[PDB]
């Protein structure tokens, strides 16, 4: 719910993120359909050239079950990954809003 979505391609996330009530930092984590356990963070942002865009970051899987976007910090779950980037952008194009 809210932020986690299963069976949402890149283009479906973009359409969702780019909708009216969303702002910069509006995001969603989506799970791959042809590949379970492969996640993607999608964030709505601004490009000086294109305007409102949606940026996609691959969530890497740790062998022990946790995840991470950047090698500098890893998490045990997606909730922790989200809570982190909502309180600091830490490399992300923007801090997520939620």
């Amino acid at each position: 719910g809210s932020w986690f979505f299963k069976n949402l391609s890149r283009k479906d996330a973009e359409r969702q993120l780019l909708a009216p009530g969303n702002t910069h930092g509006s995001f969603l984590i989506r799970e791959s359909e042809s590949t379970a356990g492969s996640f993607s963070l999608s964030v709505r942002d601004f490009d000086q050239n294109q305007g409102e865009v949606v940026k996609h970051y691959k969530i890497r899987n740790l062998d022990n079950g946790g995840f991470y976007i950047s090698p500098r910090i890893t998490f045990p779950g997606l909730h922790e990954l989200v809570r982190h980037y909502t309180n600091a952008s830490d490399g992300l194009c923007t801090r997520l809003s939620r």
Partner: peptide
């Protein structure tokens, strides 16, 4: 495709 992060 995917955004890289340092």
């Amino acid at each position: 495709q995917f955004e890289e992060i340092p």
